[PDB]
């Protein structure tokens, strides 16, 4: 594990807090910025579980290294630094205090699809929902432009910051989110990520619903081949349901791109009432 001074942070610049769910902990980093040396930033740190094979370590390393190459964007979870010298590898990334997108949305369901949360939050407006989809699209547009195929895009892999910024997670290395050509043929592409994003949109406008409710895996296989598709969510526009349907085109070349989706979500956002 050789040092990389672009990213290295001395171990003692990091007070490790509580677990987040190898494993990830909340932490405070001191002087993450060279020009703000007496500031503490809240961050998430990944490290290996107490028992962990040689593959675990190399996958962590790959992920970190892959994160380096991909660079920065506000709508992905960004690399902030790493501790590689004085002991166990720690990888330091941005922290999302408001949870993954599925829990965030579920917590914002009206109080009487139930609200699982014992700490419920204010319901989201129509405009907020579309804006959430837009940001996720931008995150994926950025990753796509960097030739990164996510392979497991889902609301569970979008995280929300204190300032309600959506950030794609785990982009660096479940069947109900896979496109058929991925499901059936292990063919993963930007187009199959687009299909997954159709499902993520459905997750959004159901406020974190479960896709294909009551459909067992064995069935789903056939049903997709049969051209089955999820019904519109009760509280979703026709425009946004056609978008989902297009993301779910059987012919992958005929799915829109993330670029295209960003342009459409951009327009739909601006037309969506902020009264609703
Ligand atoms: C970019 O991909 C990553 C790489 C990486 O290490 C190199 C890390 Cl650590 C992450 N993140 C960072 C991260 C940031 N913020 C949070 N906030 C918590 C509260 C969601 N979590 C991060 N985690 C995991 C931590 C567990 N996660 C959950 O969504 C847990 C849900 C269960 N709830 C009941 C809390 C995501 C991650 O895995 C991500 Cl998303």
**In the chain, where the domains are located:** 1-95, 96-267
Nearest CA to ligand 1 atom 3: 170
Of 2, 52, 58, nearest in space to 23 by CA: 52
122: which residues sit within 8 A by CB, 6+ positions away? 108
Nearest-angstrom CA–CA distance, 161 and 186: 33
Question: Which atom number of ligand 1 is nearest to the Cα of residue 60?
Answer: 7
Nearest CA to ligand 1 atom 18: 99
Q: Do domains 1-95 and 96-267 have the same CATH topology?
A: no
Question: Which atom number of ligand 1 is nearest to the Cα of residue 170?
Answer: 2
Question: Which atom number of ligand 1 is nearest to the Cα of residue 76?
Answer: 1
Nearest CA to ligand 1 atom 4: 170
87 has binding-site annotation: no
Residue that has been written with the tokens 């040689």 in this structure: 54
Question: Which atom number of ligand 1 is nearest to the Cα of residue 67?
Answer: 1
Nearest-angstrom CA–CA distance, 233 and 241: 8
Is 20's C-beta closer than 6 angstroms to any atom of ligand 1?
A: yes
Say if residues 117 and 106 touch (Cβ distance below 8 Å): yes
Nearest-angstrom CA–CA distance, 83 and 67: 15
Q: Å resolution of this model?
A: 2.3
Say if residues 244 and 201 touch (Cβ distance below 8 Å): yes
Nearest-angstrom CA–CA distance, 213 and 203: 12
Both structure tokens of 13: 């610049």
Q: How far does the chain reach from its first CA to its final CA, in angstroms?
A: 53
Which method was used?
A: X-ray
Residue that has been written with the tokens 């920065």 in this structure: 72
Say if residues 13 and 33 touch (Cβ distance below 8 Å): no
Q: Give the other-Cβ count within 10 Å of 87's Cβ.
A: 9
Q: Give the other-Cβ count within 10 Å of 162's Cβ.
A: 10
Of how many residues is the chain composed? 276
Hey, which of 14, 22, 24, 166 would you mutate to test ligand 1's pocket, going by the most ligand atoms within 8 Å of its Cβ? 24
Nearest-angstrom CA–CA distance, 16 and 39: 16
Is 63's C-beta closer than 6 angstroms to any atom of ligand 1?
A: yes
Is 93's C-beta closer than 6 angstroms to any atom of ligand 1?
A: yes
The architecture in CATH of the region 1-95 reads 2-Layer Sandwich (3.30)
CA distances in angstroms from 241 to 4, 83, 203, 234, listed in the order given: 46, 45, 12, 10
Nearest-angstrom CA–CA distance, 144 and 166: 17
Nearest-angstrom CA–CA distance, 178 and 155: 13
Phi and psi angles of residue 185, each rounded to the nearest 5 degrees, phi first: -120, 10
Is 178's C-beta closer than 6 angstroms to any atom of ligand 1?
A: no
246 has binding-site annotation: no
The answer regarding whether domain 96-267 maps to CATH 1.10.10.10 reads no
Say if residues 44 and 79 touch (Cβ distance below 8 Å): no
Is 96's C-beta closer than 6 angstroms to any atom of ligand 1?
A: yes
221: helix, strand or coil: helix
- Asked if 152 is an active-site residue, the reply is yes
Q: Which helix (H) or strand (E) segment is 46 a member of?
A: strand 40-47
Nearest-angstrom CA–CA distance, 76 and 200: 16
Q: Give the other-Cβ count within 10 Å of 20's Cβ.
A: 14
**Four-point Cα dihedral 41, 121, 108, 26, nearest 10:** 20
Both structure tokens of 128: 């907020």
Is 100's C-beta closer than 6 angstroms to any atom of ligand 1?
A: yes
User: Is 66 buried (19+), middle (13-18) or exposed (0-12) by CB count in 10 A?
Assistant: middle
Nearest CA to ligand 1 atom 14: 95
Both structure tokens of 171: 């982009």
CA distances in angstroms from 206 to 3, 170, 181, 199, listed in the order given: 46, 23, 25, 10
* Strands 40-47 vs 23-30: parallel, antiparallel or unpaired: antiparallel
Both structure tokens of 105: 């949305």
12: which residues sit within 8 A by CB, 6+ positions away? none
How many angstroms separate the most distant Cα atoms in the chain? 60
Of 152, 221, 215, 155, nearest in space to 185 by CA: 221
């Amino acid at each position: 594990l050789p040092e990389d001074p672009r990213w290295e942070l001395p171990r003692d610049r990091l007070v490790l807090g509580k677990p987040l769910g190898g494993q990830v902990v909340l932490a405070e980093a001191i002087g993450l910025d060279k020009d703000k040396p007496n500031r503490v930033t809240k961050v998430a740190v990944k490290m290996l579980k107490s028992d962990a094979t040689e593959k675990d370590l190399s996958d962590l390393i790959s992920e970190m290294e892959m994160m380096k190459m991909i660079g920065k964007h506000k709508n992905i979870i960004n690399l902030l630094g790493a501790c590689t010298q004085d002991g166990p590898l720690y990888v330091i990334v941005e922290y999302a205090s408001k949870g993954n997108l599925r829990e965030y949305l579920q917590a914002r369901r009206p109080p009487g699809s139930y609200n699982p949360s014992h700490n419920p939050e204010e319901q989201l407006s129509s405009k907020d929902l579309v804006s959430c989809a837009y940001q996720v699209a931008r995150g994926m547009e950025y990753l796509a432009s960097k030739k990164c195929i996510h392979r497991d895009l889902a609301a569970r892999n979008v995280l929300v910051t204190e300032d309600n910024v959506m950030k794609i997670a785990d982009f660096g290395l479940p069947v109900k989110w896979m496109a058929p050509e991925a499901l059936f043929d292990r063919i993963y592409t930007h187009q199959s990520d687009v299909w997954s994003f159709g499902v993520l949109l459905w997750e959004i406008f159901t406020l974190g619903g479960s896709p294909y409710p009551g459909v067992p895996v064995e069935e789903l296989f056939k049903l997709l081949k049969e051209g089955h598709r999820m019904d519109k969510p009760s509280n979703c526009t026709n425009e946004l349901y056609m978008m989902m349907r297009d993301c779910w085109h059987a012919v992958p070349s005929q799915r829109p791109t993330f670029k295209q989706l960003v342009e459409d979500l951009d327009r739909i956002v601006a037309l969506t009432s902020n009264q609703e």
